[PDB]
Nucleic acid binder design. Structure first.
Lengths: 141, 189, 159, 161, 165
RNA sequence: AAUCAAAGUUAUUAUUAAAUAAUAUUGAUUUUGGAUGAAUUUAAUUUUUAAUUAUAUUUUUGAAUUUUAAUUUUAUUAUUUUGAUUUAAUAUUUUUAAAAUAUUAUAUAUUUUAGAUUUAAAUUUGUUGUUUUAUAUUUAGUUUAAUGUUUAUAAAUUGAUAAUUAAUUUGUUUUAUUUUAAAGUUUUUAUGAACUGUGAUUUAUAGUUUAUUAUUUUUAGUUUAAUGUUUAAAUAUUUAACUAGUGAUGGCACAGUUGUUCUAUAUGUACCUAUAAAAAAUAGUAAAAUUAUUUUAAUUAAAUUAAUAAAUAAUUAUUAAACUAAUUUUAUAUUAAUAUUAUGAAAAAUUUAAAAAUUAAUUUUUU
RNA sequence: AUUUUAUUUUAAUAGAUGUUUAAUGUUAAUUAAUUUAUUAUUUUAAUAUUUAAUAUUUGUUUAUACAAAAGUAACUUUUU
RNA sequence: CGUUUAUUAAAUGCGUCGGUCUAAGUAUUAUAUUUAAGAUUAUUCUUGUAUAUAGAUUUUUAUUUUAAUUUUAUUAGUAGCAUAGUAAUUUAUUAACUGAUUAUUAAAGCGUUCCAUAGAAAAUUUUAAAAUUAUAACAAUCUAAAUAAAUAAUAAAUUAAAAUAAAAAUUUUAAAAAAAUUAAAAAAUUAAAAUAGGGCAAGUCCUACUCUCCUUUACAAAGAGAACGUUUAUAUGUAAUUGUAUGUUUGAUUGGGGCAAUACUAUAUCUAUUUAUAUAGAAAAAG
């Protein structure tokens, strides 16, 4: 009667709650292996390794075949690019810090430290990163 | 969880080139499961028309049988009469008919008024054949001289009531009987 | 066929609002002749007697109140007249005045064990005075009956 | 109340969109599932894969323990949250709100002598993997430290007995 | 899915741990009767719903409507108590809370009479030195409520701050 | 000749919409069969009208993801008996329909004439108002959380074991959002052989040249031309041509990655890109838009690279910073942190180039 | 020649060096003058204009066959 | 002699011919094609598909398919014949980019060629009513007004004219400097037009084959005392419908240096272990 007066009387599809994503999606693994982020608070270098360290060695300079061995920082122009996908976790909240590259030990439990998980004995206190579970010697599938 | 899949962008965008014919639609979003209705939307089964070409719906409806039973025999409560009795002229609606007919042979007076007539016209229900109209006038109105009956079928009168719904009367069957010795009616003013 | 224009769609509701079921009020309280006066609308404080009641629409002819000049239509036989009649007036704006107390009373039903008879007939009673007002009994018409096409009772009840 | 268009201050609503050529393009959002670096060989791809799982990866069974600085534990024992008599197993630390749920994961914990040059009273602890200095600090003041290293099945039955 | 079903009845009142986003700022006279009657309904609407399911599913499994198989019928015929912890039944709670109310009521009348021992041990037929108002004017409404505890009039305050007499 | 600026009120009528609510449900809108049934049949180990509390793992390196929550326990598919409740929305029709200023040879409304003129938006990649949109009135017309008060605690490290004298915050756990309009497409199944193909289908209602049953040909519906050009027509009027069909406008028959084709990529219901249906495909990579006056700190840049521009510098921006000799008792925008779909600089001064401008150049670049 | 003309100041204003809405507007605790100030130069959708003193329209005079599809705005009483 | 969506040396059609087929149809037959009937003839030679083949590929040319680049013999040849051209000659016309003839090395026609040829399209000659130039030459029917009341288009106009310079552009503006209403005709301008015509960009489409790749139904192997259907392995077919086929300056270039005012468009020149990052494999200590 008002929105369309005939489009809203005959009925089409009704939309519902839209499922979310893996909310540690942007710590993708081409950094969880390439880099590692070191540093005290408010200065986090994403130190990376040398560029030429596996391809062509014979004949390259003697004292530059080793500049490939140091944990150099990546220049901040890329620090801010990669760490941009991590900030988006709660934007406009000027006091939440960015997601970290690796999962710090206290936040993993922060998921199961929630008033709703207190009743899941399994998966609490670390069960994934726990050692593999041990079962009855008769356990079988 | 079912994690949001990112269908529109990313690889799932290009994967169509990478040998993937059917790019599925997001059947997790509309997931409120209540059926839409097709754009060639069907109109309801009610015969909207009220012209002279109004047609009888041949298709048998379920309810019409159920509404038949509940009056033939108390349907949900009284068990049925055995199929032998139902195939018999002693079944009540065949017994209420063979002994208590229900007919409306109304006479039109505009042809039998002060003007003498040999062909008085009737109206008989659509399902009174000729030789029954004979039997009727013979055994109920003592009319004993009917050599020829002449039968039409007329779409019942239609009109719009002051409200506005087309209130079409039931249909009938003009049957111009032809008596031998003419009949008449007097009207003193 | 199709449906009407909207305010003429509900004009069909507006003109004939008594066609919806239960438009007739909860068990009837107002009958012909009873003490009544209009409190709302027109002429507050006009005590009258109820001439006639049409029920299906909750309407009453309150005498001496809302007397609407009647345009009586007549043939060539008799000359028409213009006499006013009290127009069918609503009841939602009329109450009862106690036939004894003569003050605006709320008349509502009760069930009373009758005396010498056990009908327990639903009897109207005021909510203040307990004025036991019975339901008036209607009348069988004196001059009713078709002379030539009636099977006599003694002739029609022959078992 | 305004459009924080990039490269041009914060514009008003109803303002001029002559200069929002890239605000209409930073509102769609970052490309999803697409390399951030359009040219120039992404800095991630240039660097070499190291340690096939990663430089700090945690596999199933890694000994990564959350650090309980000894100063914390020593601060509590005087404050009065912890009773110095009862061998202070991790139940006491958890139930006395010294450490919460969000810091006790499977390798239970680790005692770290952080700036604690001295421990004054005989202190007994049943924790997991104290640091060598933290051990030689408790052991000097007549205390003990019997490092319990319980399986995960033991980590539960110690916190919710 | 998982929706904290172990919290439905485990609240302290009836309106708790039931997510009802449909609220309003001012719920009117009959919208409040509609509300209170509502919380209990979907608290008893839920229960007898969940009881008819368990009692019917148990009856279809051939065993007593409360799950009691052939064993726990045979033991009760023997008198051997078959349930380890017999939680207190409806007779219990409706009695374990029947005396507590019978106790308070006999303590009120025990204490209603008690305070009169001390109230009549308050000779002050004139107001104490709280009747000062050098700090700020007294409250005329309250005095009319404190007039009972005296004999001299209290409410009559001059245009000036009270002197004290 | 000629102007002259200006009428805001119908009048009169009453129980829908939308979400919500966790009780019913063999397919809503006449009366099967009406011989006696054979004709009223939808069923199978797959994300299904079944809709699932984590950030760690592990993984074609890059769109892939977390395991009972209390075992029938309540997250569960829903209305009459408060116009059924609530909050948001609000009308739709009937008939209404109005008004008394500026010259006297001519640029544009102010009374006192003269002064006065981008209509705007975009686009200006300063090929600098670059040939784009707008008749007017009213209605409808676009989603990034500007905030952290007492229970209460966080903070790193190796490739790996481990090591953690290594030094240090914050947080009763903050997540969700991400423009608007717009394709051709593309895939998923339903409809269509009344138009038109082809299959099949009619065995002699006018004229005529020739010896001839073959054959010239009367030929008023059709290879041309005029008119018509939103036309009387989303193909008609007039007309040229052609016309001999025992082998064909036609029983019913073939249907969409496919039918049919005397084959033109032609047609299969008035654009074959079939219709119909179901999607949010992509469209920032010069499309069109993106709604709130009276404000209160400035500027440009021009380099590494590009199976040629979402990425980098440099600039600009948001937020924040500390006073290192140089001078006057002058004068000084220097930075950090993040946000950033950009490759080309008037007039000069010169420099490449047939340039016939482009290119380098570097100071401009109006509220 | 000189003089003399288009930008070298003041005064009032009025915070300051130009782009993030002002709201107890019936005290969303309303009750007889709230005088609501807030209204998107385009988009569709509905109206109204311009083209339009118009383009079309204009009814003066008379050379007979019967089916079926197709319709059913459809009147009825007429002698199948 | 039929038959067609831009209507014809389109595609049909008879014959001949090539190939296939004797357990579904008659091997002077019917499938499957290429041509075209009629009349003359139908040339030289093979590198690949096909056939045959012998574990297969690789090899391999009775007939067929496609080919012949100097096949080019017959035959016609400036021809719908890649330019060269109006071919050079002859006619024909007052004037021959016409057309026809002769021959004849035609950019690379060519044996399915060539001839014969009827109503068609040309070229002459010639005659002739369409109002063909000359040429202009209303008899006919198609009012106004009165009535009904649509359409494209519409930012505005009081300026629009007109002349001149411009600066990026066709000029339109700006500027300077100039000076006439309503009605109907005309189409010079405004957008008198629609919509075609370009070329570039990103996107998608559709068709094609020695080199890319699946769902693929064929070929071969194996397994079942092989009673036939399936499953494999090895193979990968344009029968296969996926995606690529660029970018920059215009057709070449892609690197890191240097000289050319410590400018460099590619400007102009040159040089050379100036080095090819990652990921799987390869090297297991530091290499």
């Amino acid at each position: 009667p008002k929105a369309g007066c005939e489009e809203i009387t005959r009925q089409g599809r009704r939309v519902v709650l839209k499922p979310q994503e893996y909310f540690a999606q942007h710590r993708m693994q081409v950094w969880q292996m390439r880099f590692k982020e070191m540093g005290p608070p408010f200065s986090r270098v994403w130190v990376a390794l040398g560029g030429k360290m596996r391809r062509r060695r014979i004949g390259r300079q003697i004292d530059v075949k080793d500049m490939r061995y140091y944990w150099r920082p990546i220049e901040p122009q890329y620090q801010r690019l990669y760490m941009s996908r991590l900030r988006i976790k709660d934007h406009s909240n000027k006091r939440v810090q960015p997601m970290r590259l690796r999962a710090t030990n206290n936040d993993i439990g922060q998921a199961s430290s929630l008033k709703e998980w207190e009743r899941s004995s399994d998966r609490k206190y670390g069960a994934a990163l726990a050692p593999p579970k041990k079962r009855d010697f008769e356990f079988r599938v | 969880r079912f994690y949001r899949p990112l269908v529109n962008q990313g690889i799932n965008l290009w994967r169509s080139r990478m040998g993937r014919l059917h790019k599925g639609w997001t059947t997790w979003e509309y997931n409120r499961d209540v059926i839409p209705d097709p754009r060639p939307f069907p109109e309801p089964a009610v015969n909207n028309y009220f012209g002279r070409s109004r047609i009888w719906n041949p298709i048998a409806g379920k309810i019409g049988l159920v509404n038949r039973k509940a009056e033939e025999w108390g349907w949900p409560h009284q068990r049925p009469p055995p199929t032998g009795l139902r195939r018999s002229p002693e079944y009540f609606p065949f017994f209420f008919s063979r002994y208590f007919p229900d007919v409306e042979v109304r006479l039109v007076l505009d042809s039998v008024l002060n003007n003498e007539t040999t062909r008085p016209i009737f109206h008989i229900p659509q399902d009174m054949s000729k030789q029954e109209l004979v039997n009727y006038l013979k055994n109920i109105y003592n009319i004993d001289n009917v050599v020829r009956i002449r039968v039409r079928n007329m779409r019942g009168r239609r009109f719009k009531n002051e409200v506005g719904e087309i209130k079409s009367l039931p249909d009938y069957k003009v049957a111009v009987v032809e008596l031998d010795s003419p009949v008449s009616i007097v009207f003193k003013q | 066929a199709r449906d009407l224009e909207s305010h003429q769609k509900i004009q069909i509701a507006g003109r004939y609002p008594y066609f919806s079921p239960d438009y007739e009020i909860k068990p009837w309280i107002w009958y012909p002749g009873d003490t009544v006066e209009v409190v709302s609308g027109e002429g507050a404080g006009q005590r009258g007697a109820i001439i006639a009641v049409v029920k299906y629409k909750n309407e009453i002819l309150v005498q001496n109140v809302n007397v609407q000049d009647v345009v009586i239509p007549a043939s060539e036989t008799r000359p028409e007249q213009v006499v006013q009649r009290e127009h069918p007036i609503s009841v939602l704006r009329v109450r009862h005045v106690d036939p004894s107390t003569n003050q605006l009373c709320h008349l509502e039903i009760v069930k009373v064990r009758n005396k010498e008879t056990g009908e327990l007939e639903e009897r109207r009673i005021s909510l203040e005075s307990g004025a036991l007002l019975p339901i008036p009994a209607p009348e069988e018409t004196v001059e009713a009956g078709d002379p030539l096409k009636d099977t006599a009772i003694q002739d029609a009840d022959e078992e | 109340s305004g459009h924080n268009v990039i490269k041009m201050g914060w514009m008003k609503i109803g303002g001029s969109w002559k200069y929002s050529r890239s605000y209409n393009d930073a509102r769609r959002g970052f490309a999803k599932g697409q390399w951030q670096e359009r040219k120039m060989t992404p800095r991630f791809m240039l660097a070499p894969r190291v340690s096939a799982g990663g430089p700090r990866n945690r596999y199933e069974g890694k000994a990564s323990f959350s650090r309980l600085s000894l100063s914390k534990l020593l601060w509590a024992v005087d404050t009065g949250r912890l009773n110095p008599n009862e061998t202070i197993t991790l139940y006491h630390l958890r139930n006395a709100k010294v450490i919460a749920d969000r810091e006790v994961v499977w390798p239970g914990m680790v005692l770290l002598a952080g700036n604690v040059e001295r421990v004054p009273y005989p202190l007994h602890i049943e924790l997991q993997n104290a640091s060598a200095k933290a051990i030689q600090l408790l052991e000097e003041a007549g205390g003990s430290f019997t490092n319990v290293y319980m399986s995960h099945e033991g980590l539960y039955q110690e916190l919710h007995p | 899915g998982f929706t904290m079903k172990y919290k439905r009845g485990t609240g302290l009142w009836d309106e708790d741990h039931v997510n009802d986003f449909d609220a309003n700022k001012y719920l009117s006279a009959r919208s409040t009767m509609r509300w209170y009657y509502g919380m209990e309904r979907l608290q008893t609407r839920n229960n007898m719903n969940a009881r008819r399911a368990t009692q019917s599913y148990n009856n279809n499994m051939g065993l007593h409507h409360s799950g009691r198989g052939a064993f726990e019928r045979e033991l009760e015929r023997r008198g051997i108590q078959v349930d380890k912890y017999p939680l207190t039944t409806t007779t219990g709670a409706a009695r374990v809370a029947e005396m507590v109310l019978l106790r308070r009521q006999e303590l009120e009348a025990h204490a209603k009479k008690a305070m009169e021992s001390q109230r009549q041990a308050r000779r002050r037929d004139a107001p104490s030195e709280w009747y000062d108002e050098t700090e700020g004017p007294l409250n005329p409404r309250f005095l009319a409520s404190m007039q009972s505890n005296y004999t001299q009039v209290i409410t009559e305050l001059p245009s000036s701050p009270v002197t004290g007499r």
